[PDB]
Copies of this chain bind each other. A is one copy, B any other.
């Protein structure tokens, strides 16, 4: 019961962590495109 709730919070936090990782992967892709774009400007 209370053990159950704790277990649920653990599952919910693992899902939040996965949200943060995938947002990070979004920012890394976008960063690459921004640098591809300065190169495009320079050249």
Q: Which residues of B contact A12 (CB under 8 A)?
A: 13
A27 touches B23 (CB 8 A): yes
Copies of chain A in the complex: 3
The interface residues of chain A, by DSSP majority, are classed as helix
Q: List 13 additional A-B contacts (Cβ < 8 Å) besides A30-B34, A37-B41, A40-B41.
A: A2-B3, A13-B13, A16-B20, A19-B20, A20-B23, A23-B27, A26-B27, A27-B27, A30-B30, A30-B31, A37-B37, A37-B38, A41-B41
Selected A-B contacts with CB under 8 Å, 10 pairs: A2-B2, A9-B10, A16-B16, A16-B17, A17-B19, A30-B31, A33-B34, A34-B37, A37-B37, A40-B41
